[PDB]
Design a protein around this ligand. Structure first.
Ligand code: HEM
Ligand code: HEM
Ligand SMILES: CCCCCCCC/C=C/CCCCCCCC(=O)O
Ligand SMILES: CCCCCCCC/C=C/CCCCCCCC(=O)O
Lengths: 428, 428
């Protein structure tokens, strides 16, 4: 057997956190390989593999077990106990069916319209404002859109507090399972939002709130599993937050996207015109190019052959997400921001995997991917078409690839926002 | 000479106010004529004529003088001193050109989008509410839309106070020029709104506010007459309010229209589907059918022949608006609400005259007619398509034809408003 190259050390976890999104690509480049191993999270042998073929293996349910692979501290803050992400087999398929039942053309068209119109009518507010932090403005607006879409009635103060607590949770994968300053805060934030959603679910069940059929709150509150039992109210709250929290996490991509409209002159006009699905292509390129999800865990269910190496059964195994999205072979000029790369993209489930790969119904692939694209398309068309603005000069617009979680350092601060309308009025 | 039939009495003004929109049709029917006279407003001989031919005469600038014909108390409350309505000749044509310069396809498309999106994002508010008075909710929303369209920046409190003061002004034609309880209040309301708009115009001129090119505030603030002089700031305020006040008066038609969707089952579905311009046709039928403008004044500039009668030069002359809109010859089954009557309407400038007849550029015909149609189409599509609601049972939904000003007595009160969205979700 060819020996899998080793990143040496009893535990290399702190090297991963020091290099962040660059950890995996750095080792791929140093060993000149698609696969290597290290010790992490308490000394445990961890294989990492990368590329489209790796992703096909990783989402082959006959080869890879996903249950019990997420680190417990990340379950405790990001996903919640018993979350859909932690399930497998029939239980997972059934649960996933509930999430995907929401994602009809019509329900997504409504999201599209909510997003479009909420931005549109936020224009006066942004004009008022001296500076607008896109990351922060968008997390609030997306809580309002996502709640309304989900059928959750909330006051302004509730929206704002939920958004802050969700923000904390979204960031909480940054220590990839280790103890950190903020772990207890992230738990407390989770407790707060869980309780807010649980109380609404309890009211739904008792007949005190009547959200419409087809909204996530209604459907989750009434859903029975294959033996005819409701999710307990706390579990239901957890999985309901697994709709609305990652919806608000699109703020990171909103922020990245307005950065891209600034960094790559010419893009705004192309998104504005939106010919042959350019807005879509721009959004796909924002999701490919900018860092968010580093990598994902699972375990080899059987011995697996890859690149001439053997991955023994029970090996703890990680799919590289970031490095796959930036791989030289797979994407020509991967470090170039170039939406038109998507004109000749074949739609593979295994290359463009910023939100997971594989199948929506039988794999853990993100339920909200279609939603994310739609929210992003309307958000980017808004910034390119419906307002003019200046990128504030005194800010840090960089993205530190060496730090989880991925974001624009400043948040992407704009100013002098004015509605861009063609009135076509000829003064008399 | 055939003698013009007389409604006898030294002064019949109080009979006009007692019969309101029915005064003119009642006399047309009693004398079996298209023309009659009475004494009104201090004993002055007043000829009234009715029908499409009357309207063609009334808007023939060679035959009719309009200057100095509006009663001074109505100038003082409704239009403002020196308002465009009070001008004539070259001065009027020039001034009218300013108003009509705003009415480009593109500027009207923006209005369309503002209106559509402001209703859309008002849905949550109306859901919250126990009852919604359509007349009152729409006057507020239209102040917000009309101000934004006009480039006028206002706080919520300013919008609300302007709407109340504008409401008072819109009602102030109801005594057709006579003294009334509320005359002094209507003056004070006018003073308030004039001052609010003047202050913004002064700021525009001084460089302190910078509204966009093409908005009414910008264009009115900078407009020079044919000798190169700005409107004095007070006159500019008056004419600027002659954009935004009648825009908010569309609330009366919003209210009437939701009444029509209740009174005529089947209309909602037709407006919803909007095939072969049904929404447009429904709006035209709301404007034809429901009372607002009773009649309009002018003066014969020369002797005129009509229906075999002579209208002597200098006769004070009134065009019947309401009775023309309800004339048996001109509209088959005029008392029927039947939008499809507009499929075979030839677009005459002289029959469908709820907002005046004749030419937009050379006559006093309403500058905002195109705007009104657009605002109404989006408002009616919203009520028919985007919400479901119940018509509150305990209200007076009648329209008292015997009382200026025309409106639904209750305002049209609805309740249990819910967003109407097709989610098309099949519960699993
Ligand atoms: C910036 C936004 C988002 C990112 C980065 C993201 C990413 C991901 C990733 C990496 C996973 C795990 C895939 C795996 O384990 O194989 C996942 C799962 C999931 N996401 Fe997304 N997501 C985002 C937005 C959304 C949205 C908007 C929704 C709305 C419903 C959503 C719903 C879910 C759900 C339910 C799962 C779990 C599904 C399963 O395990 O079968 N996500 N997401
Ligand atoms: C319910 C709404 C409306 C009604 C009932 C209405 C009706 C009328 C009537 C009857 C006149 C006088 C016609 C004449 O003297 O021959 C007029 C003039 C005018 N209206 Fe409208 N109007 C309404 C809305 C609007 C709107 C939305 C605007 C927006 C700009 C507007 C702007 C004007 C202007 C500037 C004039 C005077 C033009 C001239 O004398 O040349 N109106 N309107
Ligand atoms: C180099 C490998 C290091 C060792 C092991 C890493 C363990 C894995 C922890 C992963 C972080 C989880 C992913 C973050 C976002 C997940 C998807 C979501 O937000 O819905
Ligand atoms: C029967 C005739 C009675 C005598 C004389 C009537 C004098 C005319 C007064 C008319 C009221 C004015 C019209 C009201 C709305 C006008 C257009 C606007 O709101 O922009």
């Amino acid at each position: 057997g060819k020996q899998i190259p080793k990143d040496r050390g009893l535990d290399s976890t702190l090297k991963v956190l020091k290099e962040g999104y660059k950890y995996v690509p750095n080792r791929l480049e140093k060993f000149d390989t698609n696969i290597f191993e290290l010790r992490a999270l308490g000394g445990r042998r961890t294989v990492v593999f990368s590329g489209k073929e790796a992703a096909e293996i990783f989402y082959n349910n006959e080869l890879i077990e996903r249950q019990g692979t997420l680190p417990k501290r990340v379950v405790n803050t990001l996903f919640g106990k018993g979350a859909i992400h932690t399930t497998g087999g029939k239980k997972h398929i059934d649960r996933k069916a509930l999430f995907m039942s929401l994602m009809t053309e019509e329900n997504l068209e409504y999201l599209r319209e909510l997003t479009r119109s909420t931005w549109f009518m936020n224009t006066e507010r942004m004009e008022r404002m001296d500076e607008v932090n896109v990351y922060k403005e968008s997390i609030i607006l997306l809580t309002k859109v996502g709640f309304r879409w989900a059928g959750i009635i909330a006051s302004p103060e509730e929206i704002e507090s939920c958004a802050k607590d969700m923000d904390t949770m979204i960031d909480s994968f940054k220590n990839i399972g280790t103890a950190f300053k903020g772990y207890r805060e992230a738990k407390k934030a989770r407790d707060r939002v869980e309780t807010f959603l649980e109380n609404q679910i309890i009211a739904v069940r008792e007949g005190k709130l009547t959200p419409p059929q087809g909204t996530a709150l209604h459907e989750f509150s009434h859903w029975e599993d294959f033996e005819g039992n409701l999710m307990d109210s706390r579990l239901c709250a957890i999985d309901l937050m697994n709709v609305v929290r990652p919806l608000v996490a699109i703020n990171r991509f909103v922020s990245f996207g307005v950065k891209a409209l600034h960094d790559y002159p010419g893009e705004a006009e192309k998104v504005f015109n939106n010919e042959n699905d350019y807005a879509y292509k721009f959004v796909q390129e924002v999701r490919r190019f900018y860092p968010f999800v580093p990598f994902l865990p699972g375990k080899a269910a059987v011995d697996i052959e890859f690149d001439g190496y053997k991955i023994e059964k029970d090996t703890f195994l990680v799919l590289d997400i970031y490095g796959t999205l930036h791989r030289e072979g797979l994407w020509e000029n991967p470090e170039r921001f170039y939406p038109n790369r998507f004109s000749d993209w074949d739609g593979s489930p295994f290359d463009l995997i910023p939100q997971g790969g594989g199948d929506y119904y039988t794999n853990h692939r993100c339920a909200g991917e279609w939603m994310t694209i739609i929210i992003m398309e309307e958000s980017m068309k808004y910034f390119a078409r419906n307002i003019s603005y200046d990128m504030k000069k005194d800010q840090d617009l960089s993205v530190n690839l060496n730090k989880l979680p991925g974001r624009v350092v400043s948040g992407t601060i704009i100013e002098n926002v004015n509605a861009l309308v063609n009135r076509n009025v000829e003064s008399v």
